[PDB]
Amino acid sequence: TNPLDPEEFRRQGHMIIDFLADYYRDVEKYPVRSQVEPGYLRKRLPETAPYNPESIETILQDVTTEIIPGLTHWQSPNYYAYFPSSGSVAGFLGEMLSTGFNVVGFNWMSSPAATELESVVMDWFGKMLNLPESFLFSGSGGGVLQGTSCEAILCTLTAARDRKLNKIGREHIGRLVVYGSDQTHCALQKAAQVAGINPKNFRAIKTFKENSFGLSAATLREVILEDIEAGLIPLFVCPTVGTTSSTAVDPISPICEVAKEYEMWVHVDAAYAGSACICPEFRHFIDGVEEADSFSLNAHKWFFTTLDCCCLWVKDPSALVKALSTNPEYLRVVDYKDWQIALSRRFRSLKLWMVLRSYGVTNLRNFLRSHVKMAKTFEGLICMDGRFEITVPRTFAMVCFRLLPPENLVLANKLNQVYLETVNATGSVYMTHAVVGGVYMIRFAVGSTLTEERHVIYAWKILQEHADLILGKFSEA
Amino acid sequence: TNPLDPEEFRRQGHMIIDFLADYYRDVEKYPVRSQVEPGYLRKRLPETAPYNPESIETILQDVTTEIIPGLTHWQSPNYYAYFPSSGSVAGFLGEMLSTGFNVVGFNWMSSPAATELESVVMDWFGKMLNLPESFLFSGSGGGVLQGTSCEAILCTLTAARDRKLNKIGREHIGRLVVYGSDQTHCALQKAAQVAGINPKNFRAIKTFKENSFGLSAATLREVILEDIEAGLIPLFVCPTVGTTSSTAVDPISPICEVAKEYEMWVHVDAAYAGSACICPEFRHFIDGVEEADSFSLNAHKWFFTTLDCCCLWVKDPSALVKALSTNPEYLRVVDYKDWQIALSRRFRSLKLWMVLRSYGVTNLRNFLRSHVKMAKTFEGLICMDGRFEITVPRTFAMVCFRLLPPENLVLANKLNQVYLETVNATGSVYMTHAVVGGVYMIRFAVGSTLTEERHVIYAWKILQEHADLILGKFSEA
């Protein structure tokens, strides 16, 4: 029997759809964070591949009993850890079609729709975000669909690297400096390592509570002037709208004005919070992006396409091409492989296309709004409880709070750590933490697609029930 | 209505399944290479995203009318271009379970099964390939699943680069020399560009017809000594099993002996042909891999997993972690994010698990064997038509041939280009070409899962008919 037999495809396909619909219907029964022990799976599974085939009915049962227990349910309506793994039916069907077609977007000829639909949706999504025409295909720029924002940052950093090193000489790679906040995600540092940036030439600029931990352009100018006086070349600054720890925001406009002075490439990283700027009341968070060179968000984080789909807009696609193309430098229809790392591109445009058509701009705006409203509600319940405290301002549907004690910081930090792990150990909910400004913080990030208001309130009661429990027996130890 | 509503998921889920099963049933009717013009899709689609939702029925109709015509059908049984984009029902289900769970393999804790199932199947697959225990988790090595061949080589090269530069100082990056043959895939040169290697320290070493265009270790030693006396530092060599142009084979064992003399990192690229070494009769093609540092293949090319799943085995995961992790260098349960450039991992091991379980070792060996034997038949048909010529030795399921014309090398090349383009313009079959040793040759790569012997024989008839009409009214001018 052919491994791609259409009728067996139809038969087994309907089974997995029923399996997944059953999973989504029952997901609340599982503990959110997996409770298996390290190595549990290597001991339950054999050590060699089977010589003979096994039935899909046998495999699906093993999925139920061996795999699902070792899952941490990001799709659970009770998952508030990290950032969301934002899914939808439309996104799933897009990946299903892409997987089903299984074409390789090596070039435009390899599937013209896989190349052209991407250029259309990137313009669709850009215009929703009110990106200037310098980022669009209608105007002077272009957009590309990539897997992760780390890869997105790697390419732009390489493009900026090649732009500078092609002018002053390749031998000066050891002087290029990469600038970010001490809240910037580690994807920036990782790209700098791969791109050949010297490890001691990475800058994690200090941020202050006075600015709610957003990078101050004046502090950046000071660091640049020191680097310049030390014989170093400033290369690349990456302000973040929505840092992963306390959802801090960097002021884009003054940062690019500082970067214009010193001929620096600016990448605006809006990996999580970027999708909300289709709502006009949030679009101010990326004001100044008109002056930046590149812009990226993770659609798989907050825009209902399944993992993974990172959307990257650039003003000058040529810069990416010159750095990433393998055709000779005297050579450098869109060929998206020259815009990214992967040569065998996936048909990621279907995901974004399906999410846009099946919901429309209006519903998508309301989806993000409901997560924020739910987080504003969670913020309100916390403020009304004198035992809790909001640590930093809430900006996009994430709330950072801590339980107060009845230094004082080291105690409050130890209290919130023991508090959080007790809560997470129940399996009822799942939050992660962050240490910002020396303060341990619990993070409440409302983005799971199945999450509704009942789950948020359910989590709040579990927080205060454990608050009553732990604050009752304190003993300062 | 929740965008992940379980029942709406089920209804639309079964819908797309029928659409895709219908697709596989009818894919022979379409022309293999797409026939649209560049820009066709921008014209037919609106320039803005809709404000209001659209039906899944309307969308799916647009997929039939707007997207399918702009597809080059990699899954068509009459597709023979490039390398196969192999899939199977089992692989499709694994990616749907992956997309269904929609978890992020950031940690072991983020989904334990997503980390452990990978370590198991990588050992399964490694043992099926009879890799030494120095590559397996059972022994002293380890295995990671990545997207593309180029990211695998990228992590491979930065780990090599960091291992050398941490011993001699970061200041010598501009002396590191990366070695490949003039047949090596463009992924090595691209990885070398991103990793900060100087563009003029990339070596595409010349291959000769007398070696069927496999890299001679003697030639490699000659080039290295040239590099050493130019003040350069040899770092990294990438012998290839099954090159993309003519499926030449580089002899691993002599190349590594050259590399241990100069303490170079050896990466064996088996992107396409590595799958076939699970059959004992092909395992000799990767002999000497025991003396190399890393080894990679694309399961999406020739192992029935869906696009994309690249298998990387390294001897010392420490090298990857120290180069790719973002925690400070003194600190530098498996955390696979440190094994690749991507941070938000996908649960790719389900694809590989499904294929290994649903078909098992015996069936898989014979799947690969059927493609090779089908190719061997095509070669046999070519050799009994005196108007054609086999250009290079067939090693893995791909035949290179050319029409002979009844100085002349230039004439022959333009003949075969015209011949090939008339054949591809029929829409009945699709093949691409290569120029190797100055000889334009056509490539017949038999690997599409739906391909059966009738399709190959059909493709032979069309080649013969077009050979009849081109050679009938043929004049030199």
From Swiss-Prot, chains A, B:
Marginally higher substrate specificity for L-DOPA over L-tyrosine. Pfam families: Pyridoxal_deC. It is an enzyme of class 4 (lyase). The keyword Lyase applies. One of its GO terms (molecular function) is tyrosine decarboxylase activity. Keywords: Decarboxylase, Lyase, Pyridoxal phosphate. The modification N6-(pyridoxal phosphate)lysine is found at residue 301. CDD domains: DOPA_deC_like. It comes from the Eukaryota. It comes from Papaver somniferum. This is Tyrosine/DOPA decarboxylase 2. Its EC number is 4.1.1.28, 4.1.1.25. Its cofactor is pyridoxal 5'-phosphate.
